[model samples]
Target: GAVFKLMKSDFYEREDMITLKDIFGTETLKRSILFSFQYELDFLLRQFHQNVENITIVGQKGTIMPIEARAMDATLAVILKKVKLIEITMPPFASHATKLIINFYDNGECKIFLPSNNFTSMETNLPQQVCWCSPLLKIGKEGLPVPFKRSLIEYLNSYHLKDIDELITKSVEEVNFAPLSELEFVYSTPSKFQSSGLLSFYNKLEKLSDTAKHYLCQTSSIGTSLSRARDENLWTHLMIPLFTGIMSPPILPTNSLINEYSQRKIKPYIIFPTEQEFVTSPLKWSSSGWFHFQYLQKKSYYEMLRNKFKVFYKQDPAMVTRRRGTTPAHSKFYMHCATNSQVFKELEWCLYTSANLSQTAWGTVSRKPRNYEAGVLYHSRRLANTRKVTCRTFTRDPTHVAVPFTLPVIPYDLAEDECFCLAL
Candidate 1:
C-alpha cells in the first residue's frame, strides 16, 4: 500500500527544481487547473508552457491579470490570452488561501500537489517550502481519497463554482486508493461555527498535547493574539522567523496564550535566524537578499516586545550546514511525541498544514469563517496492524526507501535573543 510522504525544498538535485517542467517531467500537461492564492503568469508560461499548451488558473484579483493586460506583453502574453482566469469573490475577513495544482497527464493519470507557498517565482525557488504530492493514480478511478475530495467539492460548492465538475467526475471514477495508515485529511471551510474542521483539529491537538512529553511547533506567522486556551503541560520548541513584520505582537502580557504558558511553567525554546546564519546563506547573494538595514529597524521594535520569551537565534546543525538560515521558511507544521526523542521512536502525531497560528486560521470563539485551509493529520499509533509502514520503521533501519519522512536534526537552545531581523 502507498503511504503518506513528505519532501523538503532544499538545494539538491532531487526535487530542487519547482517548475512544472521538473514536477511533471516528460508527462504532457494536456489539462491543468491551479487553485492558489497567487500566481506569476510570466513564470508559469516560461516554466510550464512547453509541455502545457495552456492552463486554467483560479485565484484572487491581485494575482490574475486582466484580459487587456495580457495583450500588452507579446512575449508570453499571447499564450496567456488562451489561458482562462477565474476570480473568486472572496468573503469578508476571509482569504482564498487554498493552494492546489491538479495536472492531467497524457497517459490517463492525474497528479495532485498541495504546496504551502504561493505560486510565484520567488516562492518557487527561494523559500524552504514543503509540498505534498499525491501518488500518480490512474484516471477514471477513485484517484483521490474521499475526505479530500469531499472538502474540495464542498469548498467549490460554497463559492457556487461548478465549472470543474467534469474534471472532478473523471478524476473520481474507478479510484484505486488504499487507506494511508497514518494520514487523515483536515480541511477548514468558511463555516461560522466552532465545529469547523480546522478548529476541531486544533482543539484535538491541544487535548493530545496535554499529555505529550515533547512537541515541535513551526510556522511562518504567529497570530497577533490567541484568545483560546492552550495546553502548557508539554515542553514545546518553537521555530519562527525573526524578521516577521513589526505588526506581529510579541509574547506579551496581553497575549492570552503566552499568559497561560507562563502560568503553567511552560517555557518554549524559540528559534530564529542569526547574523552569521544569514550572511552565509544563499539568499544573501540572491537577487532578493536578506538583512537589509531598513528591515533591521523594524526588528528592533519587535525585539522590545520579545523580551519575556526565551528566544534563540541558532538553529539545528543540519540546517546550519545547509546554509538555509537566510531562506525564509513558508512551511507550517506541528508535531507531538510521547518522549523527547528526535527520531520517530516515540512519535505520537503530526500535522503538516497551511493554517498558521492566526486566530483567523484556527477560528476563534466568534467562529466567523477566515482563510480557506487544508492539511493532513498523521497519527503514529495507528501504524500497528496496518498495511502501510510506520515512520519508526524508516528511522530504525535507514534505507533509500522514500515512504516515510525523517526529520533532519535535533535543535538546541542558544544563549540569548539579540534583536537582529532581516529582509529578502
Candidate 2:
C-alpha cells in the first residue's frame, strides 16, 4: 500500500512503468481535482472515471497579456466547458505553480499524486519521472486528522480560489488521515504563513545530519546562492544546509564549513547532463527551456565545485544503465546517503520534489519563499523494519530504489565535460 512508484522512460520498457490507470485504482470515482502548470485536456479527461460528476483544474496565472493566455485556455472550448476550470489571471506574476492530483471516489475514498513533470504529451509519454500515489484512504469519525492532511488543506486554503477552497473543506470532512501519521509532507508557498514556515526541509532532516554524510542531488534547474556577497561559495552559503543540516542564517563561506566536510570526509555528487548528452537526447533541447543556470553573481560557485558535476549518458562507458539512451533530468531529487558510502548505493533518506536547486524553492534565511513547491519524503527506518536503504537502477529491490540513474555514477571531467546550463 505504501510503495513508491516511477514512470518507465518509454514504450520500450514495459517492466519499469506505472500508468495513470494503475495510480487511479479501479474504484468508480465520483469527482476529482487536478492541479498542473500545463496539461492536455483530451489525455487528462480519459484518465478519470467514465461518469465522474465533476473535475476541477487550477492552472497558472497569465502574463501581462491576459487575453492571449485566456485564448489558449479557451481554445479547448468543447472540452474545457465540461470541467470546472479556473486559471488565475491576476497577480500576473505567474509564479503560483505546483503539480498535484487528487481523486475522490464514489465510496468516499481519496488519493493524491505528486508528480514532477507536467501533464503534456512530451512529459507523460517520455522520460523517467517519480510519482508517489497515496494509499486508498476513507473517512473515519476520529478525533482529528494528521498534520500531513492538515498542512495540505492549509496549503490549499491559502489559494483563496473558489472551487479549491470548497473542495478541501469537504475533503477534510470526508477523509481519515490517521494512518499517515508517520508520513511527512514538505511544501513551499509565496507567503509568510506559520505552517509553511514550520518545516523548511532543513528542519525536517535536521535529526539525520549526524547520521547521514554523502549528499547527492539531481535537478532540472539551479539557482544563485542566497549569500550577501556575490563571490560567496555555495558550499558554505547554501549547500551547507543540505550538506550538514546546519541552517544558520546567511552562513558565511569560510573554511570552517569546508573543514567540517573535509574532516568528516564528506562528498557531494551532482547528476546533470553533459553538453553532448543533452544535445543527443531523445527530446534533445526542445523542452529544456525551463533548465536554467546562468547569472553573473554565481560565477565563482561553479568554478569552485564544477568537478562535482556528473553527466547522465556516459558514466565511464563501462557501466550499464536501466534505460537504453539518455533521458533528460526533468525530475528533481535529493538523497542523503549513509555516513561513509562513496557511490549511489545506500541512503538514510530521499526526496522526490517539485522544488529545484533554487533559493526560492528551498528558501533562504527568510521563511517567505517565492515559489509554490511540494514534495514527499521517505526515510530508511520509517519505510519498514529494513535498516539501510540501497539504491539500484531501472527497478528497486525490497531495500532499494532510484531506478533512474546508473550504479556507481562517475563525475564529469572538468576539462572535457560541460554541463547543460541554459544561459551558458
Candidate 3:
C-alpha cells in the first residue's frame, strides 16, 4: 500500500542500486536535468562536480561515437557555462526521446527521477533497474491539481526543446503536485497523447475486480516492428491491445451495483533474461550492450511469444520471496495480482517504467509514438486510501528497496528455457 520502490540488481546489494552517486552525488545539488540513451564521460566527471547549478545534459552525438569521444560532447557546451551539453538530432522516424532526472533542490523541493539505465557505468551498475522517486515535491503543495504534476507538465512540454523552454517554465511553477493526486502519471510522446500507456492503464483499471488478475512483465529490451504480417506483429496489434485493456472488464461501468469484474484477458508472465542467464553471469555479458532482441528479423517474434517467458533466478535456496533475482534485467517492471494457481494473494497494480516492451516504446494502434516514454503507476485501488493491499504490503514496506522478480513465476522451461539471445 505504499508507492512503489524496487531497484535491486543484487551483486551483494551494492548498497541497494540507484547510483550515479544517488542522483549526481546528492547534498544540496541545485538544478539538474539529465536524460540519457548513452553517456559516460567518466560518469560525467564523477558525479557532475562543481557542486551543480544547471547541468542540462541530454544525449546522442553520432558518427557512432569515438571522434575524440564524440568530440567532448559539444566541447562541454563551449567550455562550460555550468555544463550544458544537449544533442539529439536523431530524427528520421525518431525514437529514444527520454529518460529522466529533473532534481532541483536547496530545500525548495522538486524531485523527479525515472530510471532504467543509460548514462553508462555499466548502465547504472549492471542491469535490473527501476526507480521512480518523486515525493518530496514541495513549494507547499502549490494549490493542488497534480496528476503527477500534470504529467510533469506534459512531459516537459513534449520536448519543444528550445533549450528547455526556460527550464520548462521555471521548473513547473515551483512544484506542489498535490502529492501526485493518488498516482498514475504515465507518458509517451510522439504526439496523439495527452496521457497514455493505454490511457493510463485504462484509467487505473477502474478500481479492480476482474478476479483472474495474475500478471507480470519485467523487461530490459524486447522490441518489435517486425517485417509485418504474423498477426501484424508489435506483439499482436500493439502489445496485445495494451494489456487487453489491462485485463479487460470495465468498459462502461457507471457502477451497475458491482457484480465483481469478469470477462478475462490476463497474458503477462515474463521477466526476461535467459540464454542461460547470460551464460551464468558475474556481470559476464558486460552489460550485454544494452540488451535487445530482433533475431534475424523477428524470429517469428520468438516463436510467437515463446510460452510467455520467465526466470532470472529461483533455483531453490530454501525459496522465500520478495524478489531480488540477481543482475541482468535492466528494469521496466509491471505487475498485477490476486493469483490462485500458486497463491499470490492480491496486489492490483504496480508499474515502474521508462516504457519497454515495445513497438518503439508503445505505439502502433495506428502509429504515432516515436518514443519519449516515462512511467509511474501504483494502484492498489489508489493505495486503498492509505494502506492495505496485501501480498505483504507489496514487498513489505521496503525501507530500502525490493521486488525485482519472483512470485509463483514458473514459465520458460517449456522446452529447456529459451528466449534472451541477443547479437543485435
1-424: candidate 1 lDDT, tens digit per residue: 3322333333522422244455534547776778787777666665554456547787876766443554446656656655777777776667777777777778776676777767666666665566666667565545445554554455555554565554443354444433432345566667543245433564444443333233444555544323234311111211221111111323223355455445544434323344554455566544233222223424432442344344222344343324344444455665544432344344456566777655566564345447767776666544445432234321222211121222443333334434234343
Candidate 1: which stretches are off by over 4 Å? Answer: 1-19, 49-54, 65-82, 141-145, 164-182, 191-197, 203-212, 227-276, 285-314, 317-319, 322-326, 340-346, 381-415, 418-424
Clashes of each: 6, 0, 2
- Evaluated against the true structure, the overall lDDT of model 2 is 0.61
- Give the TM-score ranking, best first: 2, 1, 3
Candidate with maximal lDDT: 2
Ranking by lDDT: 2, 3, 1
- lDDT string for model 2 (1-424, tens) is 5445666544435454566656543558766677776766655655554456667777774411122334544334444445776675534332555788887877777777887667665676565576767777886675665767876777777676676667556765567877665566777777655445324666666654434366777776766655555444333346655446455544644455566666665666667666776555556665556566674446666665563222122343444333435655567777777552145566677777787776666656554666677777767765545666666664322434554655656667666876667766
Q: Candidate 1: which pairs clash?
A: 140-173, 141-173, 141-174, 141-175, 142-174, 142-175
TM-score of each: 0.69, 0.82, 0.32
Pairs of colliding residues, candidate 3: 128-330, 129-331
True lDDT of residue 51, candidate 2: 55
Clashing pairs in 2: none
For residues 222-307, what per-residue lDDT tens digits would candidate 3 score against the true structure? 76644454423343333434455532423222121012222453444556666665556566676667667655666655664663
> What does candidate 3 score on TM?
0.32
RMSD of each: 7.5, 4.4, 20.1
